[PDB]
Coordinates of C-alpha atoms and ligand atoms in Angstrom, one line a residue:
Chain Q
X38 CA 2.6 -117.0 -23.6
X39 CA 3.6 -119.6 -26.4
X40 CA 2.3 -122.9 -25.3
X41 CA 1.4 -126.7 -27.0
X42 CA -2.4 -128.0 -26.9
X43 CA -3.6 -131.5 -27.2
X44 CA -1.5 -132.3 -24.6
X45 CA -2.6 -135.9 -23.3
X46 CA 0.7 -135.7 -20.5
X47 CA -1.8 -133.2 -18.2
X48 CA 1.1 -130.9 -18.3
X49 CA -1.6 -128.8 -17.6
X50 CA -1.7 -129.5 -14.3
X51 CA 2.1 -128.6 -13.6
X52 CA 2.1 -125.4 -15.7
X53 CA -0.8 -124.2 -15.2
X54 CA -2.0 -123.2 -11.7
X55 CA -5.0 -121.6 -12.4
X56 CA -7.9 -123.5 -14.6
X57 CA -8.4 -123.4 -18.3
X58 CA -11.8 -123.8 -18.0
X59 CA -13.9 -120.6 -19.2
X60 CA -16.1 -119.2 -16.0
X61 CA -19.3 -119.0 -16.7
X62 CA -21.4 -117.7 -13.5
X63 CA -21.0 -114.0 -14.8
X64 CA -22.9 -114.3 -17.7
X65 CA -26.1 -113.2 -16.4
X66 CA -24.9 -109.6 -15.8
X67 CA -27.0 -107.2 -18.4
X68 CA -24.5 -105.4 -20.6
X69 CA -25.7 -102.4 -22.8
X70 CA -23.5 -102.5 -26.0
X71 CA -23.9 -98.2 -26.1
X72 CA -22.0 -96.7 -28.9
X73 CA -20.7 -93.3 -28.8
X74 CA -19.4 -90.3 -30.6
X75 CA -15.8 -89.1 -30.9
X76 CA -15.5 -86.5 -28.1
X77 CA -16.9 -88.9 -25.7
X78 CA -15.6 -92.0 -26.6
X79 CA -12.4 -90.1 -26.3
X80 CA -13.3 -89.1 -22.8
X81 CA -14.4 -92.2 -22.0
X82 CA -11.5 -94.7 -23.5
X83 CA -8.8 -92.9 -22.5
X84 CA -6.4 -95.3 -19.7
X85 CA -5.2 -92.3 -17.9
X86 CA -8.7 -91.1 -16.8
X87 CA -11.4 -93.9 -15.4
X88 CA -10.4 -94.4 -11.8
X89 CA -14.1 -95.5 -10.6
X90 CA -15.0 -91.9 -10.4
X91 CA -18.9 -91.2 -10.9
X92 CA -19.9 -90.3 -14.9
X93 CA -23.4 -89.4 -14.6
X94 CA -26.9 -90.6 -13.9
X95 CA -29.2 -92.3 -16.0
X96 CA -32.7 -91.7 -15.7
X97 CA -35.2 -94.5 -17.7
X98 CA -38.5 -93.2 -18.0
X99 CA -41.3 -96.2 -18.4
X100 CA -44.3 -93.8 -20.3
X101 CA -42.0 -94.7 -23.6
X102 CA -39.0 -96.3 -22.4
X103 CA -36.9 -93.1 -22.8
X104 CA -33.3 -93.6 -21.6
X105 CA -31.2 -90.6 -21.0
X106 CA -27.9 -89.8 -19.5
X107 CA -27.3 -86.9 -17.1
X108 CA -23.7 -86.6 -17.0
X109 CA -21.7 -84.8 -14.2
X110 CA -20.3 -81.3 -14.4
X111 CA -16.8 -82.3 -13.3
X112 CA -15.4 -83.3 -16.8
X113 CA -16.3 -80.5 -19.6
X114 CA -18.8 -77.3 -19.9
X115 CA -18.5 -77.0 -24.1
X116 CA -20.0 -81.0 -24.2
X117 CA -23.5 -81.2 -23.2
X118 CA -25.0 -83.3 -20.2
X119 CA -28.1 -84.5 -21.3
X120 CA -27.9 -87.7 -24.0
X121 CA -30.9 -89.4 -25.5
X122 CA -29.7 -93.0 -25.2
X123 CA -31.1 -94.2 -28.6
X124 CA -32.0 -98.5 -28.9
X125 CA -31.2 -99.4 -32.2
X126 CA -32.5 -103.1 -30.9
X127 CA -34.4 -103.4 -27.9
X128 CA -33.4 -107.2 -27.9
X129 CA -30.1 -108.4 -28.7
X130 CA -29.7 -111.9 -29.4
X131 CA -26.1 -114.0 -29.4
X132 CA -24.0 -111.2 -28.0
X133 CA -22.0 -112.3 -25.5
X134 CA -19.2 -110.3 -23.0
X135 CA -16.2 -112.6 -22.8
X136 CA -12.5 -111.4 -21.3
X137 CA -9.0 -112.5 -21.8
X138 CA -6.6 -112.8 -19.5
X139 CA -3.0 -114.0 -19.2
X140 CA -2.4 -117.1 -17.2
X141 CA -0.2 -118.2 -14.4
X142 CA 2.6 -119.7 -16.5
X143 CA 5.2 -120.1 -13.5
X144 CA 4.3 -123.2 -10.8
X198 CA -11.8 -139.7 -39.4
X199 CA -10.4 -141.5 -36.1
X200 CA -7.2 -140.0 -36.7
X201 CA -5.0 -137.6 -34.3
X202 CA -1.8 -135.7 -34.1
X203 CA -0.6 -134.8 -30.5
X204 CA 0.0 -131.0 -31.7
X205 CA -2.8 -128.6 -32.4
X206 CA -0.6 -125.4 -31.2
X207 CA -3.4 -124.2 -29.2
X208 CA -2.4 -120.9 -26.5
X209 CA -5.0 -121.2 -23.6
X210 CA -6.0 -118.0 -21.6
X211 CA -7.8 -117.2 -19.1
X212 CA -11.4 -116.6 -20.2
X213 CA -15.3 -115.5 -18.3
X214 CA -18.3 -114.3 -19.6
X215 CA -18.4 -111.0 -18.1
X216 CA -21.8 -110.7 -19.3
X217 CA -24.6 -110.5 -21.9
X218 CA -26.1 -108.0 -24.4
X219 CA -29.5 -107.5 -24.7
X220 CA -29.4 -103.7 -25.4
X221 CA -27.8 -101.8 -28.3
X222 CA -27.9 -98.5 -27.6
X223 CA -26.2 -95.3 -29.6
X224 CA -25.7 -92.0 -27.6
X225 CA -27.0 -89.0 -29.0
X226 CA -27.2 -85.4 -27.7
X227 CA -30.4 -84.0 -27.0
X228 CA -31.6 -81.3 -29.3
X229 CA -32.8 -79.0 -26.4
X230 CA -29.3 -78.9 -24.5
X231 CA -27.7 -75.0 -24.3
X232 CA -24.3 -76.9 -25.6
X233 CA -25.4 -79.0 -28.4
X234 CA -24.8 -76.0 -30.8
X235 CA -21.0 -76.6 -29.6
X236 CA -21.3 -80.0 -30.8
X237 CA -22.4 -79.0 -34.1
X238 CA -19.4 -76.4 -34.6
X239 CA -17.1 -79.3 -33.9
X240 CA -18.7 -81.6 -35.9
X241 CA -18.4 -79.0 -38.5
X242 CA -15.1 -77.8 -37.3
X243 CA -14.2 -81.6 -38.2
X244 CA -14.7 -81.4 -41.9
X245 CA -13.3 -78.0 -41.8
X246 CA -10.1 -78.1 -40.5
X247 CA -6.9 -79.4 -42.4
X248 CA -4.3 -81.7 -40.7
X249 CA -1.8 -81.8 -43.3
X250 CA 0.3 -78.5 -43.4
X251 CA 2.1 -77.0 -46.8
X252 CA 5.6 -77.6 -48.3
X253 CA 8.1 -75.5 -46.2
X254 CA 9.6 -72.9 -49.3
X255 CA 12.9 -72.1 -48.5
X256 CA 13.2 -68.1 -48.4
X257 CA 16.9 -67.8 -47.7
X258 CA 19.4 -67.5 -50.8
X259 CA 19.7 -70.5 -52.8
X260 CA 23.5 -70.5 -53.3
X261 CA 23.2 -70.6 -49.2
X262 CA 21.0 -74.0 -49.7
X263 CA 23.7 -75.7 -52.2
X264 CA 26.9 -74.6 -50.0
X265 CA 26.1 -78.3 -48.3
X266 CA 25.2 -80.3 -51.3
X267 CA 28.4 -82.0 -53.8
X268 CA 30.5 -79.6 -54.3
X269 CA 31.0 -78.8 -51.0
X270 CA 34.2 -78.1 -48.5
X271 CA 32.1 -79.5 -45.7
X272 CA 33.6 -83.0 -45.0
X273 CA 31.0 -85.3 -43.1
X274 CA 31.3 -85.3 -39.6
X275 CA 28.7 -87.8 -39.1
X276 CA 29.7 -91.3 -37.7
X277 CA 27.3 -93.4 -39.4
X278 CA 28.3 -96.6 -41.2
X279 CA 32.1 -95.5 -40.0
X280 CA 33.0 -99.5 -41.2
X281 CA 36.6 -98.4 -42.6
X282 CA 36.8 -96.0 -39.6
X283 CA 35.9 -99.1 -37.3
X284 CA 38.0 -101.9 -38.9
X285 CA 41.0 -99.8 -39.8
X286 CA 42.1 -98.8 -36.3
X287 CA 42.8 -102.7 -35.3
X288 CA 45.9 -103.7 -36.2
X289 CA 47.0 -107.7 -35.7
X290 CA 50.8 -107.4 -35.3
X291 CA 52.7 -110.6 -34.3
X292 CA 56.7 -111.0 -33.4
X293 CA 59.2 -114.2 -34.7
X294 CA 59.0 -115.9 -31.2
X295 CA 61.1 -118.6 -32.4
X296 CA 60.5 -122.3 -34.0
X297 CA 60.7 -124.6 -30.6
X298 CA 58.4 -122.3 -28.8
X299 CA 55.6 -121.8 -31.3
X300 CA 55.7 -125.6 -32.1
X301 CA 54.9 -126.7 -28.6
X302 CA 52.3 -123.7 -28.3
X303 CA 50.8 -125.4 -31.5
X304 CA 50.8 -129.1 -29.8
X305 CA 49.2 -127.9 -27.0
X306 CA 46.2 -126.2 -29.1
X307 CA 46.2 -129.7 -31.2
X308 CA 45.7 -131.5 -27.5
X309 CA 42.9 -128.7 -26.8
X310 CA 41.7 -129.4 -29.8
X311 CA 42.5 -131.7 -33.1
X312 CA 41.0 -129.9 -36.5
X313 CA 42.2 -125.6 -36.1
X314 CA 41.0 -123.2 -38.8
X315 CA 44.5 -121.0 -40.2
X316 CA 42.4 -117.5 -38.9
X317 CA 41.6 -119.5 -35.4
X318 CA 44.8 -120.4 -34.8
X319 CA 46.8 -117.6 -35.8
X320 CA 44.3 -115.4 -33.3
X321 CA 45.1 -117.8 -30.8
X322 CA 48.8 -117.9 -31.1
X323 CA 49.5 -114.4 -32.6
X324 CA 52.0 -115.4 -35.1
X325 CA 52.9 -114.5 -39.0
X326 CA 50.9 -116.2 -41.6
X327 CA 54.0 -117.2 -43.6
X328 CA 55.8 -118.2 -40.2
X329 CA 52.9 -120.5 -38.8
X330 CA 52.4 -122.2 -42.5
X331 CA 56.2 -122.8 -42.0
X332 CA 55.1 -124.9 -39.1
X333 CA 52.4 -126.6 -39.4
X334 CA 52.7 -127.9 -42.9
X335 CA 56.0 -129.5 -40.8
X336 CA 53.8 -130.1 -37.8
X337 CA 50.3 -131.1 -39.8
X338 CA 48.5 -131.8 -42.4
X339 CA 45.5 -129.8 -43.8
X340 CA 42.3 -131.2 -45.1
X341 CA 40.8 -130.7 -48.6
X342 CA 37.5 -133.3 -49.1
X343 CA 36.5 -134.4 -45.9
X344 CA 33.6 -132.9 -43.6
X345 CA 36.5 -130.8 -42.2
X346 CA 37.8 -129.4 -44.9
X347 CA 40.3 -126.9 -45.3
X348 CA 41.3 -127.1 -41.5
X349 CA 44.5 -127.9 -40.3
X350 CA 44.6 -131.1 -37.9
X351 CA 47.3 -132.9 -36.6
X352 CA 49.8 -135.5 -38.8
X353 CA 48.6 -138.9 -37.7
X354 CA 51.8 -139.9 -36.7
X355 CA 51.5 -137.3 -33.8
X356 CA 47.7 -138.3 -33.7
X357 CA 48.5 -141.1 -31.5
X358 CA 50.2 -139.1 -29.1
Chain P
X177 CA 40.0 -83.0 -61.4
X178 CA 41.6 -82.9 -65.0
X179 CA 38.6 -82.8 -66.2
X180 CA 37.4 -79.6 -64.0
X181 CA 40.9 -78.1 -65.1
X182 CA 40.7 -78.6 -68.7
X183 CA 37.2 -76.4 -69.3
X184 CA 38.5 -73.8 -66.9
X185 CA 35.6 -74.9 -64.1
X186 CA 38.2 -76.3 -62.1
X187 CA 37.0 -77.3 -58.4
X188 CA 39.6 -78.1 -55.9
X189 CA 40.8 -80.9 -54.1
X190 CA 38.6 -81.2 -51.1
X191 CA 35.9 -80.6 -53.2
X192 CA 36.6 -84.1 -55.3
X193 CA 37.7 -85.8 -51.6
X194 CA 34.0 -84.4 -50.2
X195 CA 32.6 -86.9 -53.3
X196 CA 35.5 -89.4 -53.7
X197 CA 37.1 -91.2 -50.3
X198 CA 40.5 -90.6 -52.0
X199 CA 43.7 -91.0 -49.9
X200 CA 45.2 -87.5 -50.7
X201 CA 49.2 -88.5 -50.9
X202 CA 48.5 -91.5 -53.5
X203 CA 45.6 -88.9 -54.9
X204 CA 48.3 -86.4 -55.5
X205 CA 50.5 -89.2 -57.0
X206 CA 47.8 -90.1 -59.5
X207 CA 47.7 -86.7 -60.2
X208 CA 50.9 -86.2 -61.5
X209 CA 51.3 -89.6 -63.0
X210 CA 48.3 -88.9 -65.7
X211 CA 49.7 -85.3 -65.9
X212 CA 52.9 -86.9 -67.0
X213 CA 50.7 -89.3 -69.5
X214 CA 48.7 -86.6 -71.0
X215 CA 51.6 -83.8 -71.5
X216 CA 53.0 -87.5 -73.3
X217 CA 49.8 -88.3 -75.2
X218 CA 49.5 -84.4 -76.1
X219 CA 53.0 -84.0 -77.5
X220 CA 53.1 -87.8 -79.4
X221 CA 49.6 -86.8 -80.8
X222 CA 47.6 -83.1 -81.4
X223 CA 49.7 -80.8 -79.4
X224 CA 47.8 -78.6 -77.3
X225 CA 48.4 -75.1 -75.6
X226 CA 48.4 -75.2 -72.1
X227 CA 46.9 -71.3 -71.9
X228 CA 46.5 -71.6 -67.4
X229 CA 44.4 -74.7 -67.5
X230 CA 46.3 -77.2 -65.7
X231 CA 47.4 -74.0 -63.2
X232 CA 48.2 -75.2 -59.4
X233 CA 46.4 -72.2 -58.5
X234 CA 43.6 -70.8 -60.3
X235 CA 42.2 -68.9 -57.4
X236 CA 40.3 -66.7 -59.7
X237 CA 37.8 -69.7 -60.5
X238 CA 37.0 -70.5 -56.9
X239 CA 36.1 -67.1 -55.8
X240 CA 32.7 -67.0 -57.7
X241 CA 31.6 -70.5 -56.2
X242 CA 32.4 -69.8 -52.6
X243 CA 30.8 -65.8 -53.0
X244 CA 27.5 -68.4 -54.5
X245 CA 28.1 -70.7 -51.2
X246 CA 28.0 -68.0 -49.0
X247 CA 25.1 -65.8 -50.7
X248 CA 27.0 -62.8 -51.3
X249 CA 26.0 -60.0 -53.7
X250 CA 27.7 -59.6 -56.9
X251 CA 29.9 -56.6 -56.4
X252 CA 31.9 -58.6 -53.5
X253 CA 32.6 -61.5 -55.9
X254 CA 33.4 -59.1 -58.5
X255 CA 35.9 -57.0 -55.6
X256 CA 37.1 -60.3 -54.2
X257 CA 38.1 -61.6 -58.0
X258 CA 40.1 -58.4 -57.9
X259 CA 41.5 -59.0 -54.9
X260 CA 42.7 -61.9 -55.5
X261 CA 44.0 -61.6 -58.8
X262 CA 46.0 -58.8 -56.8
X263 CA 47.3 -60.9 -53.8
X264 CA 49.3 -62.8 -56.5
X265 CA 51.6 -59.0 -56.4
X266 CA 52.1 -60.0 -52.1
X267 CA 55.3 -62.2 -51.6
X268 CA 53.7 -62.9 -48.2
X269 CA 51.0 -64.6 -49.1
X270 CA 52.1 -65.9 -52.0
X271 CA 53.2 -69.2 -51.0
X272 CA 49.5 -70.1 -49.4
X273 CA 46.9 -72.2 -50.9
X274 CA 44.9 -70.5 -53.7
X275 CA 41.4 -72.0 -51.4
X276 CA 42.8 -70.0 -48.1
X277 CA 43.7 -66.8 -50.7
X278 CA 40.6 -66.5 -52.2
X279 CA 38.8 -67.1 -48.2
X280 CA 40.8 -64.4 -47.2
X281 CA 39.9 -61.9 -50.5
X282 CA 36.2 -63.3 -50.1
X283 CA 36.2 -62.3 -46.3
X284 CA 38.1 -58.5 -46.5
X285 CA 35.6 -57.6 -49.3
X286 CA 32.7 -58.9 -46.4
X287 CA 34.0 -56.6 -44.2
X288 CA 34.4 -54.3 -46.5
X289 CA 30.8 -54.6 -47.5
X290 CA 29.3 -54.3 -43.9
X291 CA 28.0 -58.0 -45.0
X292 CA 26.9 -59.7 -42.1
X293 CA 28.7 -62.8 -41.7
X294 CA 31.0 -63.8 -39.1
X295 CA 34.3 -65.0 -39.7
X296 CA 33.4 -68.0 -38.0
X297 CA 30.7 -68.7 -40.6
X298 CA 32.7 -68.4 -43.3
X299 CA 35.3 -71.2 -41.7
X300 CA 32.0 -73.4 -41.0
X301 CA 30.8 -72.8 -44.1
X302 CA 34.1 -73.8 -46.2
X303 CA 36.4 -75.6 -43.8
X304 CA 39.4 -72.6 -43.8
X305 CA 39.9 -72.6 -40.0
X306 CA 39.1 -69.3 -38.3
X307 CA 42.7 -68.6 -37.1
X308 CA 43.8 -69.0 -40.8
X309 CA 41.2 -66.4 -42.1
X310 CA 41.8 -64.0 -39.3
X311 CA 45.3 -64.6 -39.9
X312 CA 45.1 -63.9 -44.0
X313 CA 42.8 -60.6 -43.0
X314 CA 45.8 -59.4 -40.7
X315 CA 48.3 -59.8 -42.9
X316 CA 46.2 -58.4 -45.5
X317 CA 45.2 -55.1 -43.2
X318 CA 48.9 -53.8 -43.7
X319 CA 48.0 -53.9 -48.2
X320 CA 44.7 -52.0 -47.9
X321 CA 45.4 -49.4 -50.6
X322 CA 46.6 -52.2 -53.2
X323 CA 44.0 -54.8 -52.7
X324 CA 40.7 -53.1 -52.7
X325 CA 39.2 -52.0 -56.4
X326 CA 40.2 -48.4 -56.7
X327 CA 37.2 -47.4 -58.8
X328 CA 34.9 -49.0 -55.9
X329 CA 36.0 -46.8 -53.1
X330 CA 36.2 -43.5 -56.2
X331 CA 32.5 -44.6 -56.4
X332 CA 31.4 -44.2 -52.8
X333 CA 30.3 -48.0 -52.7
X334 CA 33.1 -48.6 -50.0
X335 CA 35.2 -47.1 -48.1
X336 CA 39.1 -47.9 -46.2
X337 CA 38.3 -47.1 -42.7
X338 CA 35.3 -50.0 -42.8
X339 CA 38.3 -52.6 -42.4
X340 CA 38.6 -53.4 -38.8
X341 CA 42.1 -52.8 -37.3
X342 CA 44.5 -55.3 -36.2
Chain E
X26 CA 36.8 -55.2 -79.8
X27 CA 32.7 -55.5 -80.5
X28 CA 29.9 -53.7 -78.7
X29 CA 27.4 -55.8 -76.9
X30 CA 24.2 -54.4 -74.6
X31 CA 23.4 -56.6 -70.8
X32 CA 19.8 -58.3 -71.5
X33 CA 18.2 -55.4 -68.5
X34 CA 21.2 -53.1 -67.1
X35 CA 21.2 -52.1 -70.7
X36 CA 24.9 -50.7 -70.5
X37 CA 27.5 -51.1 -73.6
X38 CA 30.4 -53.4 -73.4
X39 CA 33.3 -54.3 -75.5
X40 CA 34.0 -57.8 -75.6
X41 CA 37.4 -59.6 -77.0
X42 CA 37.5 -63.5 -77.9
X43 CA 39.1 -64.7 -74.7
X44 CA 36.5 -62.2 -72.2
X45 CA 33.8 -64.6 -71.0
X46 CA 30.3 -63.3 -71.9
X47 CA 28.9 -61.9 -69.0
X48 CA 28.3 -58.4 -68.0
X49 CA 30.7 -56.1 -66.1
X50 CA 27.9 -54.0 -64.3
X51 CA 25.1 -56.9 -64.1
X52 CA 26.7 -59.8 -64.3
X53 CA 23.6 -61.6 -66.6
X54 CA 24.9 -63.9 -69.2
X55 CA 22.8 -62.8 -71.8
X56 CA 24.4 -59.9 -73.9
X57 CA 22.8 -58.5 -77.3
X58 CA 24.9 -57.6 -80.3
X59 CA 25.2 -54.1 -80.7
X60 CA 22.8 -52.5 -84.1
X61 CA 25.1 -51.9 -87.2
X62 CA 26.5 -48.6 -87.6
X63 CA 25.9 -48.8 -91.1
X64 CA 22.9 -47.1 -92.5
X65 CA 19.9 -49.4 -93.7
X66 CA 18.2 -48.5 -96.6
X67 CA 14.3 -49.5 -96.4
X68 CA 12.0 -49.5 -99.6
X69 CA 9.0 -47.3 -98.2
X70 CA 5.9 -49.2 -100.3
Ligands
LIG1 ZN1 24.1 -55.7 -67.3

């Protein structure tokens, strides 16, 4: 939504139904900035899952502030479902929740009315107070699966070899230069393209083509020789033949090197 | 192409048109103009003897790089090169192309060979359409004896009755 | 005309001027010149 700020005509008002104002009574919601490692961030980021469906439990102990998740059994069995919710800062100060959202476009001393500002919809959805890093408990029966695939991480290769050609080689070259295969690709086909139109244009005769060429003078004075002869379909030779007779062409002016009209039929 | 011709590596022209987009008739009436120029330029200056290097044909040189394009062994270039050189003795296919002569040679000696490769390969593989190979191997079925290396089939290597029928 | 060996298939071949070197049997373009029929005398110290 491309839009100009410092707008002093409250065109605001007109384009702008909703307020550009940031909301602000959100901001006392407690948000937990939790960080987390790849196979649940992956479960957990994804758009095609999160429909509101239940995740877990936590459990907060107060004897020594131990957080821990207890997640469901519905998603995985190899991941574990017991975290130790780690608080790498048991106050967070200046760490704010803020959203963006699209807005209803439809319905010294000195200043320049322009800033090129885009305003969007914006609310404290909350603030931080809790930094908190999810890792698995050491007594879970799966986190020994999450150590093979933290291993199997580092161990696995993603990039696969050059492909080696095993047939015979002449078999490989009977496509490459010297080759009967002619191309029976279409791509870039310009001379293919260009060379099947073909402009032909008959010697309808002198009265006729001059009056066609006064009335595209009344349409319009100043014609181009590739403009006109499209529009009348004539010779190149032939139609030179009239209008030098007919008009005159121009060779310094702003309009150069279009034929206009003699300016003794100008005036009529 | 006179260049290909003169050190006896001649390619052919569709091979030259698969590089060059070359209108063939003025092509072949380029051709003949610097043929003209250099038989001129040869005889004004150092004369030189012609020996089968500017030869229309010259299907023996294209039988070794379309046995390469098509991955055959040795001994079925070797048998098609001997073909060929004996289809020039056949006044029925002596009028065609030296390229569909040396298809034809290239694809009796594959069946000949038990090679596995389909006619229809071979016309994919160097733009001789399949009814014109099947065509040459028909009317090449009736000169059997001829055509096929003597000492191959004295050998055991081959053998007459591997030639389909017609 | 001249005897000449195939670099592996090892077989003897006759070449003349105009026969491209190649070999009949292999078809490897390396050929050997054939040893000297002539006797070689060599001083035994
Ligand atoms: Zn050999």
């Amino acid at each position: 939504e491309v839009f100009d700020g410092n707008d002093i005509e409250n065109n605001e008002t007109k384009v702008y139904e909703e307020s550009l104002d940031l909301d602000l009574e959100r901001s006392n919601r407690q948000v937990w900035l939790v960080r987390l490692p790849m196979f649940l961030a992956e479960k957990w980021r994804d758009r095609n899952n999160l429909h509101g469906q239940e995740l877990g439990k936590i459990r907060i102990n107060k004897d020594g502030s131990k957080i821990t998740l207890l997640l469901n059994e519905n998603d995985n069995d190899s991941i574990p479902h017991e975290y130790d919710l780690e608080l790498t800062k048991k106050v967070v100060e200046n760490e704010y929740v803020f959203t963006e959202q699209n807005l209803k476009k439809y319905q010294r001393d000195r200043y320049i009315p322009y800033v090129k500002t885009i305003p969007k919809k914006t609310a404290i959805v909350g603030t931080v107070c809790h930094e908190c890093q999810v890792m698995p408990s050491m007594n879970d029966p799966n986190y020994h699966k999450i150590v093979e695939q933290r291993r199997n991480i580092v161990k696995l290769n993603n990039k696969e070899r050059i492909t080696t050609l095993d047939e015979t080689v002449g078999v490989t070259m009977s496509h490459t230069g010297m080759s009967m295969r002619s191309d029976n690709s279409n791509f870039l086909k310009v001379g293919r393209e260009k060379a099947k139109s073909n402009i032909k244009s008959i010697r309808m005769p002198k009265k006729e083509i001059l009056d066609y060429l006064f009335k595209l003078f009344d349409e319009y004075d100043y014609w181009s020789l590739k403009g006109l002869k499209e529009r009348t379909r004539q010779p190149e030779a032939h139609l030179k033949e009239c209008l030098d007779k007919v008009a005159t062409l121009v060779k310094k002016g702003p309009y150069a090197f279009k034929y206009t009209l003699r300016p003794e039929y100008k005036k009529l | 192409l006179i260049g290909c011709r003169r050190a006896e590596v001649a390619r052919t022209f569709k091979e030259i048109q698969s590089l060059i987009h070359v209108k063939t008739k003025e092509f072949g009436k380029t051709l003949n103009i610097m043929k003209n120029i250099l038989r001129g330029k040869s005889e004004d200056g150092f004369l030189k003897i012609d020996t089968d290097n500017m030869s229309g044909a010259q299907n023996l040189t294209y039988i070794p790089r379309f046995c390469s394009h098509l991955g055959l062994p040795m001994q079925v270039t070797t048998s098609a090169e001997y073909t060929a050189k004996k289809c020039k003795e056949i006044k029925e296919i002596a009028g065609k192309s030296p390229i569909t002569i040396a298809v034809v040679s290239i694809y009796l000696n594959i069946l000949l060979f038990q090679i596995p490769i389909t006619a229809a390969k071979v016309g994919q593989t160097l733009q001789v359409t399949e009814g014109t190979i099947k065509s040459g191997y028909k009317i090449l079925y009736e000169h059997r004896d001829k055509l096929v290396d003597p000492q191959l089939i004295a050998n055991g290597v081959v053998s007459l009755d591997n030639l389909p029928g017609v | 005309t001249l005897k000449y060996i195939c670099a592996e298939c090892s077989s003897k071949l006759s070449l003349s001027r105009t026969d491209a070197v190649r070999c009949k049997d292999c078809g490897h373009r390396i050929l050997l010149k054939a040893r000297t029929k002539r006797l070689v005398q060599f001083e035994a110290r």
